[PDB]
Amino acid sequence: LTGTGVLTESNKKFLPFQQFGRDIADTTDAVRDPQTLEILDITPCSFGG
Amino acid sequence: FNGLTVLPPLLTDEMIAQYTSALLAGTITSGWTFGA
Amino acid sequence: QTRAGCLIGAEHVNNSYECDIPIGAGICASYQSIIAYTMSLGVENSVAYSNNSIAIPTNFTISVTTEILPVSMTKTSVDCTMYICGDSTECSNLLLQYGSFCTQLNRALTGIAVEQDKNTQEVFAQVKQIYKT
Amino acid sequence: CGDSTECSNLLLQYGSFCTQLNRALTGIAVEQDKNTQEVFAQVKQIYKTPPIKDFGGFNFSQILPDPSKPSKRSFIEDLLFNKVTLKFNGLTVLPPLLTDEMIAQYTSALLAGTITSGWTFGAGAALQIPFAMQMAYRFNGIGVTQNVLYENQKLIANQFNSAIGKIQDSLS
Amino acid sequence: STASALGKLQDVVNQNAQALNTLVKQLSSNFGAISSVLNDILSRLDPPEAEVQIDRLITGRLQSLQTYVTQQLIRAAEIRASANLAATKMSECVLGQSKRVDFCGKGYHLMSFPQSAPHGVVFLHVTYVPAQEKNFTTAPAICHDGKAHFPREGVFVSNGTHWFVTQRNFYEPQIITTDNTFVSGNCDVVIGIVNNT
Amino acid sequence: AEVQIDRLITGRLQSLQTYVTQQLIRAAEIRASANLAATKMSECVLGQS
Numbered sequence: 253l254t255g256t257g258v259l260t261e262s263n264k265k266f267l268p269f270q271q272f273g274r275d276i277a278d279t280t281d282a283v284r285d286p287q288t289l290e291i292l293d294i295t296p297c298s299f300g301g
Numbered sequence: 302f303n304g305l306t307v308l309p310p311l312l313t314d315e316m317i318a319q320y321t322s323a324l325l326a327g328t329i330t331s332g333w334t335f336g337a
Numbered sequence: 338q339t340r341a342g343c344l345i346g347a348e349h350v351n352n353s354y355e356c357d358i359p360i361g362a363g364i365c366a367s368y369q370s371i372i373a374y375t376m377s378l379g380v381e382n383s384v385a386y387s388n389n390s391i392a393i394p395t396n397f398t399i400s401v402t403t404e405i406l407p408v409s410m411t412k413t414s415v416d417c418t419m420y421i422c423g424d425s426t427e428c429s430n431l432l433l434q435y436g437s438f439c440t441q442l443n444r445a446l447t448g449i450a451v452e453q454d455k456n457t458q459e460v461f462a463q464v465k466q467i468y469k470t
Numbered sequence: 471c472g473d474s475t476e477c478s479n480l481l482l483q484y485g486s487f488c489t490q491l492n493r494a495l496t497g498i499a500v501e502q503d504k505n506t507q508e509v510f511a512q513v514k515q516i517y518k519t520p521p522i523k524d525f526g527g528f529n530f531s532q533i534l535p536d537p538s539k540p541s542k543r544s545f546i547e548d549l550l551f552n553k554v555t556l557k558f559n560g561l562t563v564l565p566p567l568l569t570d571e572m573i574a575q576y577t578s579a580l581l582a583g584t585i586t587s588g589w590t591f592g593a594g595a596a597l598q599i600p601f602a603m604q605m606a607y608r609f610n611g612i613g614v615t616q617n618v619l620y621e622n623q624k625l626i627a628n629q630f631n632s633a634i635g636k637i638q639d640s641l642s
Numbered sequence: 643s644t645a646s647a648l649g650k651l652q653d654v655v656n657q658n659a660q661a662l663n664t665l666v667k668q669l670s671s672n673f674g675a676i677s678s679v680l681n682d683i684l685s686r687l688d689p690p691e692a693e694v695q696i697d698r699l700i701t702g703r704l705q706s707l708q709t710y711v712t713q714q715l716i717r718a719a720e721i722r723a724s725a726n727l728a729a730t731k732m733s734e735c736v737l738g739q740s741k742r743v744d745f746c747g748k749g750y751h752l753m754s755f756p757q758s759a760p761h762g763v764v765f766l767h768v769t770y771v772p773a774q775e776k777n778f779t780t781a782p783a784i785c786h787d788g789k790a791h792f793p794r795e796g797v798f799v800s801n802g803t804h805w806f807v808t809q810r811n812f813y814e815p816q817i818i819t820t821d822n823t824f825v826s827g828n829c830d831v832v833i834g835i836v837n838n839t
Numbered sequence: 840a841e842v843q844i845d846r847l848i849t850g851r852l853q854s855l856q857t858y859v860t861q862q863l864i865r866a867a868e869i870r871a872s873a874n875l876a877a878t879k880m881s882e883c884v885l886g887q888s
């Protein structure tokens with residue numbers, strides 16, 4: 253799963269069979285690392301005109 | 302966000318309320334005479 | 338069966354009430370079970386006209402009614418390259434030869450936003466000073 | 471696609487343009503219906519003219535509904551209807567919610583209310599007022615004292631009748 | 643208590659949100675290409691036909707964006723019309739008493755009060771509505787001494803025995819006097835005269 | 840046949856979108872006319888102007 257953004261600690265709960273959640277419109281919002289099996293949070297860095 | 306942004310309105314809700322209150326006090330105390 | 342089409346699951350009624358869920362061709366349905374009937378315009382009355390009779394009211398009431406009007410919407414801006422290419426170089430190069438669509442695309446949205454601010458300003462800022470009760 | 475499975479599969483991957491198209495068309499249709507509703511349904515009840523008609527010499531016979539015709543439409547309305555003249559592969563025409571008969575009913579109700587009551591029935595409950603006693607007010611609203619109307623009642627009625635005949639002749 | 647009263651504003655908000663949401667959702671459409679994700683199609687081919695696939699994506703997304711802009715323009719025109727109407731009502735009913743029938747409020751108008759709303763305005767119109775009618779007998783003129791008297795302002799009524807002049811919107815009789823009626827010639831031509839003093 | 844079907848689909852879709860847009864413009868015009876008609880109905884039939 254390839255994507256760009258900043259990674260932070262997340263308190264959301266995955267069931268032991270999911271791998272990565274989303275919120276709406278199919279935009280990834282939380283990913284669990286394959287190694288330490290920890291749920292993170294994804295937010296892209298700000299852009300502006 | 303995916304390259305799509307929302308911009309804040311120039312007038313915040315507070316000054317909108319201020320306009321409404323000014324209009325309403327004017328129409329109570331003065332009537333219509335403050336419209337000219 | 339009606340002019341609008343074929344209706345299944347509702348039973349006809351010879352009466353006539355107000356219209357709840359409009360169906361068409363002058364008929365509509367409502368809930369008692371579900372019934373479909375003919376729309377009724379309202380209570381029919383015959384005003385007692387003559388050539389030497391008038392009716393003058395004797396009392397009055399004061400009523401207060403609401404009226405709602407939208408005046409604005411959210412101002413939105415868009416970026417072409419981020420939206421279409423998703424931060425890629427070759428995609429940007431390919432898009433480069435399509436001429437300048439993006440200039441007028443952004444121009445239209447900018448005009449929309451300016452118009453929104455103008456709308457609110459002209460609707461509300463009808464006074465010069467700020468009075469106080 | 472014209473009822474073809476492969477065309478439908480190919481079209482399926484073009485996103486959801488069709489939902490937007492159908493939504494827009496449905497919005498247009500609902501707008502049409504609400505449009506007619508707001509322009510015509512301006513009254514709360516349905517009024518009726520008295521069986522005997524003596525409007526101070528004025529003559530609305532060419533404008534009031536005629537019971538002979540089943541549609542109960544006035545003569546001018548029939549002329550207008552006869553003047554103008556007007557489902558294959560997905561196109562469909564839906565009938566209006568209000569048929570012509572109820573449109574004629576609202577027209578007749580408005581017209582009979584404004585003959586008898588005046589402007590009052592739009593602002594509460596209709597009140598009786600003789601028609602010769604109503605045009606007087608309508609003079610008093612344009613800077614002409616009511617003194618005129620009563621002294622020229624018959625002439626005004628004749629002019630109104632002649633105009634209402636000439637309008638029919640020109641239209642026909 | 644009653645809900646579903648702020649219908650128009652809620653519908654406006656929902657329309658804008660839905661348009662934005664479907665515009666975002668359009669990004670996951672193949673549009674006739676092998677995949678809707680750009681990185682994979684770049685990483686799974688060579689430029690010769692990768693540029694063709696990217697051309698497909700560019701065309702599709704450009705059409706989507708163009709359609710979205712067009713809808714925005716149409717809705718903006720409609721909202722501008724509504725805002726112009728709102729400004730007219732604000733300047734004609736709030737800052738003055740209106741005379742045009744059924745412009746603001748059902749009945750005779752008295753005043754209006756504005757209140758803000760998340761994306762619009764709410765008017766409270768105060769109107770005057772008569773009630774408790776009655777029945778009377780009228781006559782367009784009064785013959786006295788052979789002359790005709792017409793009312794300065796009001797209308798003639800009678801409760802069966804005596805005649806009075808009243809205002810036209812609230813039952814208030816007054817005895818007829820030569821200072822609220824004016825003369826116009828002799829009464830042999832008006833249709834509806836009645837004898838009185 | 841896939842490419843030919845794609846061409847036909849694109850052309851017909853473009854035509855349909857054009858038709859819908861013209862319908863929308865005409866509908867806005869008709870709505871403005873009907874608003875004027877309703878105003879005239881209220882102001883001139885239900886009272887003097």
Ligand SMILES: *[C@@H]1O[C@H](CO)[C@@H](O[C@@H]2O[C@H](CO)[C@@H](O)[C@H](O)[C@H]2NC(C)=O)[C@H](O)[C@H]1NC(C)=O
Nearest residue numbers: 268269270271283284285286287288289290291
């Ligand atoms: C991959 O191997 C490493 C090395 O052991 C695992 O890391 C250990 O994880 C457990 C439980 O999470 C800890 O108690 C150990 O202290 C960790 N060891 C080190 C050296 O950090 C890791 O969990 C493994 N990943 C898997 C199995 O998915």
Ligand SMILES: *[C@@H]1O[C@H](CO)[C@@H](O[C@@H]2O[C@H](CO)[C@@H](O)[C@H](O)[C@H]2NC(C)=O)[C@H](O)[C@H]1NC(C)=O
Nearest residue numbers: 394395396397398399771772773774775812813
């Ligand atoms: C006009 O209407 C008002 C109410 O709309 C009447 O006021 C009521 O009068 C009765 C008897 O006098 C009282 O029992 C009620 O409590 C009154 N209501 C209010 C709200 O005050 C008034 O009497 C009517 N006047 C005329 C002349 O009809």
Ligand SMILES: *[C@@H]1O[C@H](CO)[C@@H](O[C@@H]2O[C@H](CO)[C@@H](O)[C@H](O)[C@H]2NC(C)=O)[C@H](O)[C@H]1NC(C)=O
Nearest residue numbers: 523524525527528529530531532533545631635
């Ligand atoms: C009101 O106007 C109508 C207009 O049609 C008059 O009806 C005509 O009356 C004349 C004379 O009686 C007849 O020769 C015509 O044939 C009638 N026309 C129709 C279509 O019936 C009617 O008489 C008028 N009423 C009054 C009281 O003047």
Ligand SMILES: *[C@@H]1O[C@H](CO)[C@@H](O[C@@H]2O[C@H](CO)[C@@H](O)[C@H](O)[C@H]2NC(C)=O)[C@H](O)[C@H]1NC(C)=O
Nearest residue numbers: 382383384385386390392598774775776777778
């Ligand atoms: C004014 O008088 C007329 C004539 O009597 C009234 O009209 C009738 O009123 C009676 C009331 O007993 C009803 O039964 C009739 O049905 C009415 N006639 C019609 C044609 O509807 C009228 O109601 C009176 N107005 C007021 C305000 O009392």
Ligand SMILES: *[C@@H]1O[C@H](CO)[C@@H](O[C@@H]2O[C@H](CO)[C@@H](O)[C@H](O)[C@H]2NC(C)=O)[C@H](O)[C@H]1NC(C)=O
Nearest residue numbers: 778799800801802803804805806814815816817
């Ligand atoms: C019509 O109204 C007039 C004036 O109000 C009435 O005349 C007087 O009515 C009072 C009672 O309201 C009596 O005490 C008087 O004797 C009446 N006459 C005079 C000269 O004052 C009249 O009675 C009313 N008639 C009807 C039928 O309502």
Ligand SMILES: *[C@@H]1O[C@H](CO)[C@@H](O[C@@H]2O[C@H](CO)[C@@H](O)[C@H](O)[C@H]2NC(C)=O)[C@H](O)[C@H]1NC(C)=O
Nearest residue numbers: 387388389522524526600602781832833834835
């Ligand atoms: C109001 O209408 C009545 C009834 O139609 C008219 O009364 C008629 O008056 C004439 C004389 O003017 C008599 O020859 C009739 O017999 C009366 N008819 C009835 C049924 O009694 C009255 O003239 C009309 N008045 C006005 C001003 O229009």
Ligand SMILES: *[C@@H]1O[C@H](CO)[C@@H](O[C@@H]2O[C@H](CO)[C@@H](O)[C@H](O)[C@H]2NC(C)=O)[C@H](O)[C@H]1NC(C)=O
Nearest residue numbers: 784785786787788789829830834835836837838
């Ligand atoms: C109103 O009063 C006039 C004036 O008296 C009446 O007109 C007279 O009527 C009588 C008999 O009807 C005649 O002998 C006179 O020649 C008429 N003129 C005059 C100057 O007296 C009239 O009849 C009365 N009634 C009405 C309804 O007008």
Ligand SMILES: *[C@@H]1O[C@H](CO)[C@@H](O)[C@H](O)[C@H]1NC(C)=O
Nearest residue numbers: 348349350351352372373374
């Ligand atoms: C309606 O009336 C017709 C004839 O008057 C009758 O045949 C029919 O059964 C009636 N329907 C109902 C639901 O009463």
